[model samples]
Target chain A: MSIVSQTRNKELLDKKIRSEIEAIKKIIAEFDVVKESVNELSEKAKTDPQAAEKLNKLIEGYTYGEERKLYDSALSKIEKLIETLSPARSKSQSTMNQRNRNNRKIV
Target chain B: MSIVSQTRNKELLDKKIRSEIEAIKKIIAEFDVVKESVNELSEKAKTDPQAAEKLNKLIEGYTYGEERKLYDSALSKIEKLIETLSPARSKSQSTMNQRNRNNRKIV
Candidate 1:
């Protein structure tokens, strides 16, 4: 019974890891193009007044603000899951998670 | 001296309010176009498989996530400001602020 339980737990862990990888992959695939566009536009904003102002007002205020809220929520959940999986994890690990969350590729 | 202090305090309070407004506006200015594309792509995602998959993975992950994290922090600062400004304020008001965060227009 003990061996059976251990095997079951391992299977479940493997399944979860796979699921998370898929989810992460899907998220990255969607973001690459926009990342390029944002970089381009950031450059555009440097020189183009109309584009810059438009970017600042519309892009910065609304779009970024709204999406940031959602992403934080999702990332919070992901971090929570990570902590639960590794109860002995350090505070620095949580900080690293924040860094990873910031760096994950959408492209 | 008492009257001067009172006047100065009022000026400071007014200044803080103005500062908050400017910050909110600046944040919004960074995010507009992406919002429109996300919405349009949301519609597209309903029909296009590869585009849908790419978008679902990337759009939902990186661009949205980064900005969402930042927005949540900013909005959080805004809400905390609102609360600290009004400690006698009801819990319901805080809940209302959460709703506003969700409903704010990036456009």
Candidate 2:
């Protein structure tokens, strides 16, 4: 028997989408904190061998072998869902700032 | 103008829900790896104060002041959405096992 089927309730699905959006919004609010923490930790690691080892372990410990990649993958997926669910505010300000920084780095 | 509205296309909404469900599925598939890593790191921290300090930094570094709580909050929200969108397999095997382990800890 096939396991997949369409959602039966448009109303409930809409409500759930809003809930997911809220969760993503909260995450976005905290995005800069985590991002800055990562950058700071990396900088500290450059001077502290122990901190560097810990950082290496954390990144290498994830199942996919790259914690940063997995985190970005999940965040990107959620952002895509948020965009589909809320087109008006598809990209959060924090996301835009991060994107801009990445673009400048590439220049 | 009010921003949120019920999705107009059930067909496309269904498609999008499935995509979110797939993302959660991939995350669950790798849950054991992350869980094991956290446990191992914590255990190591008992002997290495630097590891402990790093752990504190990681957990305290989040905007909410608790990274684990934030991770759990997001995971629970996604799981709830997955249940609504795909009721057939609402709970993944890893989730079940994790729950069992938690229950055992309480006993």
Candidate 3:
């Protein structure tokens, strides 16, 4: 006799989603503090070319690196999982989504 | 005997400048990891409205807050010291500064 698998593996998926959420949350918590310092250094660049050069290199490196790669990978995984778990909405919800799209187009 | 103070307090000023630079450096080191995560989350937002909302809140909060205030204050302080220590350049340098100003205006 062959057994058929029916369960969604929800428990394992839940754990993965929770892990990414926690990791992203921790990074976000540090954002304000770091962003502020960057802004200040950016402003200093107006009068100091060396400061500007250093800031540019730092920003460029971060913009394209392992950190971004990991982050994007994690988020994509979590979002895909979330999409799978999400319930399909009715016509009204579809209309609402369309309205939002329209507004964005106008913007 | 009246003692007239003539020293520029070079040592103390140097200490302060060094301290600010160190502090800024520490913050910059933390940026790559944080920025990567934020970028990833932002990309996830394209298909997920809820993710977009959360990302918007996080960005707005960081863009205008204590972080910016503190960062700007420190940079201003550092820039002033740097300017003071900077040698007075010739008229050509002043012309260079004006040329920079003109370029920025055109841009």
Candidate 4:
């Protein structure tokens, strides 16, 4: 009897993958905005004392340091996951022929 | 009159950073679980034909390719943001003293 096989809810899993990608992008965007403000504030400070003081206050208020580790940890863990996606483990097609027969038996 | 400085709601921004890191870790864990299933199915296939067919069915069901691009994009974008973090532009303290005095004026 030929029938379909089910393992995990890959639909949901793929959705999860997509949303996580979006979330990562969102974080990057947020980080960029803060950085833009710092740069914008600095450029304004070139001619204006008020901008200079505002920039100073901003720097002191936030550590603005040790921030990269968040993204670093994110990328490191995800890289390992990315490495795992391949199903094949470099075997000769010798076993593959045998496996294809087994697949036919199941169907 | 010296008072506390306020710019962006850094409190919320920091919260956003932490939650994004947590979300990233969660995705990695999810990806790990799926990979574990692939490996486990493969290992069992050595002893049982059913397992081999199940693994085969799974491999066909999912493209199991182009998955790494998600993480690759995540890392590349985050790397750009990470580069922009420091408020000080690799400057010398000669100007640092000038900035320090300016900071004093703000306080």
The per-prediction CA RMSD against the true structure, in angstroms, equals: 25.7, 30.8, 23.0, 11.5
lDDT of each: 0.44, 0.45, 0.42, 0.53
For lDDT, the strongest prediction is 4
| lDDT tens per residue, model 3, A1-107 | 00121133333433543453354345444434444444446667878998888775455211111233333354344334434323445325422222333445744
Comparing only chain A of model 1 with the true chain A, what is the TM-score? 0.37
lDDT (10s digit) by residue, model 2, range B1-107: 11122233333444554565565445444434434433445767998988888775454211211223334355456545544433355537323332222435744
Provide per-model DockQ scores. 0.02, 0.01, 0.02, 0.07
Candidate ordering by lDDT (highest first): 4, 2, 1, 3
CAPRI quality level assigned to candidate 3 from its DockQ score? incorrect
Model 3's interface RMSD: 23.9
Worst 10-residue lDDT window, candidate 3 chain A: A1-10
Off by over 4 Å in 3: A1-106, B1-19, B45-77, B90-107
TM-scores for all candidates: the values are 0.25, 0.21, 0.25, 0.38
Q: Write the per-residue lDDT of candidate 4 for residues A39-101, one digit (tens) a residue.
A: 557668888999888876666323342355555466556445544533346635333333432
Off by over 4 Å in 2: A1-14, A26-36, A61-107, B1-107
Chain A TM-scores, per candidate, are 0.37, 0.30, 0.34, 0.48
Of candidate 2 chain A, the 10-residue stretch with the lowest lDDT total is A1-10
Candidate whose DockQ is highest: 4
| DockQ of structure 2 | 0.01
Please state the error at residue A25 of candidate 2 in Å: 2.1
Q: Alpha-carbon error at A39 in model 4, in Å? A: 14
Model 1 chain B is weakest, by summed lDDT over 10 consecutive residues, at B60-69
